Amino acid sequence: VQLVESGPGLVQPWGTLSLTCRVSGDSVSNDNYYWAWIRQTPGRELQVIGTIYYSGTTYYNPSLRNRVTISLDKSVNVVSLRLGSVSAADTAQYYCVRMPSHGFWSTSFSYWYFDLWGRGHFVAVSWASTKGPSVFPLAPSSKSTSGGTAALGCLVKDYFPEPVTVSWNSGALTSGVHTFPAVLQSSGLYSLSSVVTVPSSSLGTQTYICNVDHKPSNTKVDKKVEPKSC
Amino acid sequence: DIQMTQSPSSLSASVGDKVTITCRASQSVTKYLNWYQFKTGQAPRILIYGTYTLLSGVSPRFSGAGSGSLYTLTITNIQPEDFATYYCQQAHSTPWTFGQGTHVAANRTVAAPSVFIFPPSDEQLKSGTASVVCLLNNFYPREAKVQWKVDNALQSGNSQESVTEQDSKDSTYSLSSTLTLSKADYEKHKVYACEVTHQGLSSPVTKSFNRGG
Amino acid sequence: NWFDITNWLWYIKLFIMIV
Ligand SMILES: CCCCCCCCCCCCOP(=O)([O-])OCC[N+](C)(C)C
Ligand SMILES: *[C@@H]1O[C@H](CO)[C@@H](O)[C@H](O)[C@H]1NC(C)=O
């Protein structure tokens, strides 16, 4: 059973924001399960936006009830969430969730718990428009070397909205990688760095490419990082 | 809405220790109390429902207890895969509500950071600004002081800091201090230096270069 | 809504199980 959420990265204020969750294990009309939408705001607070059932019945959190709708699309096995009149305070990670419906004679009747969660999908709500990042190499030198290992990276600067995804050598290099959280610059754009430590002996034989992705602006960038020889 | 509060908000523990997390509610929730595990990298994961019941595939180190308005999650022999943030949720009332979360991090032996410095990329000088990066790799504890010095003068708000989350296996942190400047100012001065103070260093560690060579 | 109803239904069910 797999739960893949998807939707837009950035939504304009006063717009309506729609997300879809593809359920890859069993049918949403299984009627042993309810399905639900739960969101986490920046600041770690967990809010349960809504609950839905194969029969059509929905529950909506009162503070949102005036402007939210959940529905099932049985033919493709997806569950949809629409949230209208959206403001800055709706910027959040949106999780799709499954909830056992225990029947009257079940040992665990009236016990309501969220037993399976999707990976989430982040949605920023802002008047500001999308803007892709610039990628600059952080080349190794004698000054970014400590002992037998050298450090290198690439700076992903000036982008909006979050997030950016960074990989090294197309996923084959995943040992000692540190891609930092973003920081909000004065300009109102985001920037981070991604750095890896490798054995210094491996420069001049192994190529190191960093692969940046920014789906809100359809940005893909491959930057090659060459040793400097200080 | 039933308000939920966990204690402590954050804690840290050595591998093997017993860890108890307390969840108090504004009303009585009559044992309709669920516990969830949140780790970066994976999808959120339930571990307990209805105070006591473990779900399949959850290790029996986790155990739930409580009644009335007061419940408690217990990690018996805490393991590397258990370091995470835990949430309690009430199913008693119509709008389901979570706690604020308890972050459980690792205790570890002191580890000094390796310090690296990066001057700005030629491409970026072409763009018209200049960022210089100081990297502090694989250290513990989290507290570290990073000062920038340009020709021996200390900087203001020119730089920003960022800190990774604790490494799953290393149990250590890394930190980037990026100092951003106009190309003008960067071309003005010569000697750019990054000074680091941290426990498990005896003397402050400085990394510096001369602009150009 | 139905959720809150199950809260009481549990006690109803207990009343039944006793007999
Ligand atoms: C008409 C029926 C008469 C019932 C009168 C009320 C007294 C019955 C006491 C029964 C106590 C058993 O529940 P408990 O284990 O203590 O905790 C609550 C367990 N649930 C969360 C599943 C509900
Ligand atoms: C880690 O354990 C040592 C051993 O007693 C203790 O002194 C120290 O305070 C602990 N650190 C934290 C952050 O709890």
Note whether B146 and B161 are within 8 A (CB).
Answer: yes
Q: In this structure, are B158 and B180 located in the same domain?
A: yes
Residue A45: φ, ψ to 5°: -85, 135
CATH of the domain at B170: 2.60.40.10
Name every chain A residue with its beta carbon within 8 A of the beta carbon of C1: 57, 59
Residue B12 CB less than 6 A away from ligand 2: yes
Q: Are residues B115 and B195 in the same domain?
A: yes
Same domain, B98 and B45: yes
Interatomic CA distance for residues B101 and B5, integer angstroms:
8
Query: Quick one: B90 and B149 in the same domain?
Result: no
What is d(CA B85, CA B158) in angstroms, rounded to the nearest whole number?
33
Quick check: helix, strand or coil at residue A41? coil
The residue segments making up the domain with residue B9 are 1-108
Give the tokens for residue B205. Answer: 């560690």
3-class SS string, B36-98: EEECCCCCCEEEEECCCEECCCCCCCEEEEEECCEEEEEECCCCHHHCEEEEEEECCCCCCEE
Q: How far is CA B46 from CA A56, A154, B11, B58, B77, in A?
A: 26, 37, 20, 8, 19
CB contact (8 A) between residue B94 and residue C7: no
Contact C7 B92 (CB under 8 A): yes
Is C3 an 8 Å CB contact of chain B? Answer: yes
What tokens were used for B154?
Answer: 């200390």
User: How many Å apart are CA A96 and CA A140, to the nearest integer?
Assistant: 42
Place of tokens 């200080």: A230
Question: Do B88 and B127 fall into the same domain?
Answer: no
**Local structure of residue A32 (DSSP, 8 states):** S
Experimental method of this PDB entry: X-ray
Parallel, antiparallel, or unpaired for β B4-7 and B19-25?
antiparallel
For ligand 1, the distance from its centroid to the CA atom of residue C11, given in whole angstroms, is: 6
Of the candidates A5, A1, A38, A42, which has an alpha carbon nearest to the alpha carbon of residue A21?
A5
Nearest CA among B169, B12, B64 for reference residue A176: B169
Two structure tokens written together for A131? 């803007």
Backbone φ and ψ of A20, nearest 5° = -130, 140
Cα angle vertex B128, ends B126, B134, to 5°? Answer: 90
Q: Is A3 helix (H, G, I), strand (E, B) or coil?
A: strand
Distance between A118 CA and the closest CA of chain C, angstroms: 23
Q: How do strand B10-13 and strand B191-198 relate by DSSP bridges?
A: unpaired
| Cα–Cα distance measured from residue A24 to residue A2, given in angstroms and rounded to the nearest whole number | 5
CATH 2.60.40.10, chain A: domain bounds: 128-225
Q: In chain C, whose CA is at the least distance from the CA of B93?
A: C4
**Residues B148 and B80 placed together within one structural domain of the fold:** no
User: What is the distance between the alpha carbons of residues A83 and A15, in angstroms, rounded to a whole number?
Assistant: 9
Distance from the CA of A146 to the center of ligand 2, in angstroms?
29
Q: How many angstroms separate the CA atoms of B122 and B206, rounded? A: 24
Experimental structure resolution, Å? 3.1
Nearest atom within ligand 2 for CA of residue B108: 1
Instruction: Copy the structure tokens of residue C16.
Output: 């039944």
Domain count along chain B: 2
Q: Which residues of B23-56 are buried (b: 16+ CB within 10 A; e: fewer)?
A: bbbeeebebbbbbbbbeeeebbbbbbbbbeebbe
Cα separation of A163 and A188, whole Å? 14
Report how far residue A37's alpha carbon sits from residue A51's, in angstroms, rounded to the nearest whole number.
Answer: 7
Alpha helices, DSSP H only, in chain A?
62-65
β-strand partners of B157 = none
Q: CB-hemisphere CA count at 13 Å for A30?
A: 18
Q: What is the dihedral of CA A179, A180, A182, A187, to 10 degrees?
A: -100
Decide whether any atom of ligand 2 lies within 6 Å of the B208 Cβ. Answer: no
* Cα pseudo-dihedral B179, B184, B188, B192, rounded to 10: 10
Torsion (CA) C7, C8, C12, C13 in degrees, nearest 10: -10
The alpha carbon of residue B99 is apart from the nearest alpha carbon of chain C, in Å, by: 20
Within 10 angstroms of residue B16's Cβ, the number of other Cβ atoms is: 9
**Domain over A128-225 is classified CATH 2.60.40.10:** yes
Q: Are residues B32 and B53 in the same domain?
A: yes
Question: Based on C-alpha coordinates, what's the Rg of chain B?
Answer: 23
- Helix, strand or coil for residue A118? coil
Same domain (yes/no): B171, B98: no
Per the CB < 8 A criterion, the answer to whether A103 and A47 are in contact is: no
The residue to which tokens 């809405």 are assigned: B1
* Same domain assignment for residues B130 and B51: no
Q: Confirm or reject: Cβ of B149 under 6 Å from ligand 1.
A: no
Strand partners, B23: B6, B71
β-partners of residue B136 are: B115, B175
Sign of the dihedral defined by the CA atoms of residues A163, A169, A171, A176, in that order? negative
**Whether the Cβ atoms of residue A108 and residue A102 lie closer than 8 Å to each other:** yes
CB-neighbour burial class of residue B76 (10 A; exposed 0-12, middle 13-18, buried 19+)? middle
Q: Distance, in angstroms, between B36 CA and closest chain C CA?
A: 20
Rounded to 5°, angle at Cα B69 from B65 and B71: 20
| Cβ–Cβ gap B94/C3 under 8 Å | yes
**Chain A with chain B: Cβ pairs closer than 8 A:** 129
Quick one: DSSP state of residue B29? -
B102 Cα distance to chain centroid: 12
Q: Nearest-CA neighbor of A191 among A159, A228, A226? A: A159
Q: How far apart are CA A69 and CA A82, in angstroms?
A: 5
**By the CB < 8 Å criterion, does C19 face chain B?**
no
- The dihedral region occupied by C2, where left means phi > 0, alpha psi between -120 and 50, and beta the remainder, is alpha
A84-to-A17, A45, A65, A194, B212 alpha-carbon distances in Å: 6, 21, 10, 36, 55
B95 plus B147 within the same structural domain: no
Spacing of C-alpha B62 from chain mean position:
23
B81 touches B41 (CB < 8 A): no
